[PDB]
Ligand SMILES: [Zn+2]
């Protein structure tokens with residue numbers, strides 16, 4: 194039932210209900226002549242919605258808001274980007290124009306600015322040191338340490354035991370490292386272990402790209418990152 198690339202024409206977006214009041218959003222982009230899927234999260238926040246991550250670009254993110262209106266019909270009032278790369282901040286300007294309040298850590302905002310990427314409006318305090326967590330509406334935001342990027346956040350939905358790892362967590366089908374240009378390979382397993390330590394009760398774990406699974410995605414990622422380290 195989870196959608197894959199061949200289900201999703203580029204420019205379209207699918208929603209997937211994970212639990213009561215919790216969805217992923219799935220979109221695709223072409224990169225170097227291959228097509229990659231990308232996940233984000235949507236969490237019901239009373240009669241409003243919280244969005245985690247853009248749908249990887251302006252057109253996708255417009256389509257995302259259109260699909261949310263079509264299928265859920267509650268207002269997206271806030272969005273949080275989990276790190277500074279384009280699959281996470283690309284589309285922030287579309288969200289902002291549509292009246293969504295955009296958020297990221299000050300580390301992410303700064304790195305987005307350096308990269309010339311779109312920059313969320315608001316700055317999330319309380320996430321500066323590895324192991325820091327803050328509640329943000331119906332989710333907990335956690336900074337595990339540097340991993341895929343120095344700023345990467347993960348998002349937990351306590352009502353549903355859903356853990357969204359973003360790009361710090363790989364899907365099982367990914368056997369070799371993704372983009373590690375901005376990674377801290379040295380710290381990435383230590384960061385993954387902080388996630389395990391903080392969220393041992395998680396039932397559904399959503400990678401930045403590809404299929405959900407369970408907490409097995411954590412050690413899977415560590416194995417892949419450690420192999421890449423020793424390449
Ligand atoms: Zn990234």
Ligand SMILES: [Zn+2]
Pocket residue numbers: 278280359360401402
């Ligand atoms: Zn990513």
